[PDB]
Design a protein around this ligand. Structure first.
Ligand SMILES: [Mg+2]
Ligand SMILES: [Mg+2]
Ligand SMILES: [Mg+2]
Ligand SMILES: [Mg+2]
Ligand SMILES: [Mg+2]
Ligand SMILES: [Mg+2]
Ligand SMILES: [Zn+2]
Lengths: 68, 84
RNA sequence: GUGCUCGCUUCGGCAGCACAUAUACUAAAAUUGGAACGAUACAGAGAAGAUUAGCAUGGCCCCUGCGCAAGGAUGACACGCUCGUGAAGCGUU
């Protein structure tokens, strides 16, 4: 069950990274990736995702609001 | 020869279908269009038989083709008679 | 090693002087990790009927090409965002 969960998390992370690489400026993919990382209890991974999204576009209000 | 201005063809094609395959594809597409218009209209009188035939339960009438049921829309008088 | 000594002095040699001063990824190896994409098998050719010409657009996708040319299936890949429920703040009672 641990290997199946690891394969599911790898597939979800691969689809999230592919959706990020397909359209970088779409911030909803960043928000969904960060919320999925926070739902799996990975605080520093979601913090790195939010910091990458703020490096992509720091002028969005909702990125700061969701990360805070 | 003008290779970029010849009519377009691709290798490993298989060719154009015959009259029977095109006829049954047209019949399947007509069935799909009739089912799409029935689901858009949301008519509960349409039924498919166990032998696979269209039936109007409000009229209790069998139909050979999809357009026979598509023209069965009499049906208002039969619906008023079967309402009570 | 070569050449010469107001040498020691035998005639061989010693001693002194002068010149000549720093190669190598050091392997004839032991190792180590990456693989053409061919055989089989999976496999199956864009555009709402069918047969199809294509030009792009994006980048942790490349190949052929001397290419700021042209090809590689258009090289491939690349879709789903108008009301209530609560919370916070503000002003009136
Ligand atoms: Mg077509
Ligand atoms: Mg061309
Ligand atoms: Mg091209
Ligand atoms: Mg071509
Ligand atoms: Mg073509
Ligand atoms: Mg292209
Ligand atoms: Zn009827």
């Amino acid at each position: 069950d641990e290997e199946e969960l690891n394969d599911y998390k790898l597939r979800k992370r691969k689809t999230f990274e592919d959706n990020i690489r397909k359209n970088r400026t779409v911030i909803s993919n960043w928000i969904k990736y960060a919320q999925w990382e926070e739902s799996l209890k990975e605080i520093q991974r979601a913090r790195s995702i939010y910091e990458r999204a703020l490096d992509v576009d720091y002028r969005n209000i909702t990125l700061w609001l969701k990360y805070a | 020869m003008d290779f970029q201005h010849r009519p377009g063809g691709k290798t490993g094609s298989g060719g154009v279908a015959s009259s029977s395959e095109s006829n049954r594809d047209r019949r399947e597409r007509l069935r799909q269009l009739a089912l799409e218009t029935i689901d858009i209209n949301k008519d509960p009188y349409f039924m498919k038989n166990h032998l696979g035939s269209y039936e109007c339960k409000l009229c209790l009438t069998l139909h050979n083709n999809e357009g026979s049921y598509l023209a069965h829309t009499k049906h208002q008088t039969n619906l008023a008679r079967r309402a009570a």
